[PDB]
Amino acid sequence: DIFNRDPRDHYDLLQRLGGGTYGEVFKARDKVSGDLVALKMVKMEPDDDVSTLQKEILILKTCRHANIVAYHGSYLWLQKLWICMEFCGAGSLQDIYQVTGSLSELQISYVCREVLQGLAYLHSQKKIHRDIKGANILINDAGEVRLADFGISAQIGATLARRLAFIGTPYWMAPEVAAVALKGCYNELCDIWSLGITAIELAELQPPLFDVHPLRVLFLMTKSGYQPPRLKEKGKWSAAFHNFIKVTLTKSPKKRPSATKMLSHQLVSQPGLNRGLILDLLDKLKNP
Ligand SMILES: COc1cccc(F)c1-c1cc2c(cn1)cnn2-c1cccc(N2CCN(C)CC2)n1
């Protein structure tokens, strides 16, 4: 679904949401339906070709699940690629917790369940996300949870190249990912570790060791006695939440549970985990 035309033929842009090295993200409205969408603009380089683009764009269409932002279409126009996707109006979990403060245990439990459903899908497709963190998990206005994309392997062209060249920030990375040159390699269970880190992030407003220099953190993950992190406050959280963190942050990947196994954990299988918990969080955001 690549159109060689101006995306403004089909969409009215409404707001510029964010930017980066990747490019620009916009809230837009479908001119027929009136439905909101997100439009992501990336600049095309002279090196880039439409044959490699079509294949990359095809995978965006097919790697489909309720807990991953849905792809609608793409536009190639004036050396800019626009990707059209499902709108998640509350932004990322980072956007939310930086305003609301720490999520409740039930809110975190719901988010973790929803992310794990996405991961179980991706892992079943033999895909490693590699980028699970609060900033890459979006919330729509109905309180539903969506991964921004299927992770590092969803990135296109020069953005993908940069992602391979620079491992980036290590705070959510499994130690086996950090140490891939030095020890033996990694697999999809790195995402489970990342989810454990994310649960702490939502609880405490930052991942463990966030005040330590990232090169120092990366270095410490190489050494034999790297200790998995823990929640700082004992009394605030249930035994189930502490145990969820313990098991997701299992140091040995051989012993770390799969996404589907984690979905049977007490924390994420308890009743009353629904989007209403996040509707309450968004009502708190709106009406502090
Ligand atoms: C982490 O999400 C991305 C990261 C890089 C490139 C992207 F296109 C996205 C991205 C954002 C998306 C969607 C898909 N992808 C779908 N809705 N939506 C959205 C909607 C409303 C507000 C808002 N934000 C999230 C990012 N903060 C910094 C600003 C507010 N985002």
Q: Confirm or reject: Cβ of 76 under 6 Å from ligand 1.
A: no
Tokens linked to 202: 């939502």
Domain that holds residue 64: 1-87
> Could you tell me the resolution of this structure in angstroms?
1.9
Does residue 110 share a domain with residue 47? no
- Listed residues 59, 87, 115: the one ending a domain: 87
Does residue 101 share a domain with residue 9? no
Strand-pair partners of 42: 81
CB 245 within 8 A of CB 231: yes
Does residue 227 share a domain with residue 103? yes
Tokens linked to 183: 């020890």
Method: X-ray
CB 133 within 8 A of CB 157: no
Of 153, 158, 159, 162, nearest in space to 128 by CA:
153
Does residue 183 share a domain with residue 82? no
| Range 103-107 contact pairs with CB under 8 angstroms and sequence separation of 24 or more | 103/202, 103/203, 103/281, 104/277, 104/281, 105/237, 105/238, 105/241, 106/272, 106/273, 106/277, 107/202, 107/277, 107/278, 107/280, 107/281
Tokens 């979990």 map to which residue? 93
CA of 53 to the centre of ligand 1 (A): 22
Nearest CA owner, ligand 1 atom 24 = 91
Q: Confirm or reject: Cβ of 106 under 6 Å from ligand 1.
A: no
235 in a labelled binding site:
no
Of 264, 285, 119, nearest in space to 198 by CA:
119
CA of 196 to the centre of ligand 1 (A): 22
Does residue 247 share a domain with residue 123? yes
Tokens 């790697």 map to which residue? 63
Does residue 253 share a domain with residue 120? yes
Does residue 204 share a domain with residue 149? yes
Does residue 262 share a domain with residue 281? yes
- Listed residues 63, 87, 111: the one ending a domain: 87
Does residue 114 share a domain with residue 29? no
Does residue 71 share a domain with residue 2? yes
C-beta neighbour count of 184 within 10 angstroms: 8
Beta strand 2-3 with 71-77 is parallel
CA distances from 90 to 22, 79, 149 (A): 21, 30, 16
- Listed residues 38, 58, 87: the one ending a domain: 87
Does residue 112 share a domain with residue 72? no
Number of domains in the chain: 2
Q: Which DSSP symbol is given to 17?
A: E
CA distances from 49 to 55, 84, 158 (A): 11, 20, 12
40 in a labelled binding site:
yes
Q: Confirm or reject: Cβ of 148 under 6 Å from ligand 1.
A: yes
Does residue 206 share a domain with residue 150? yes
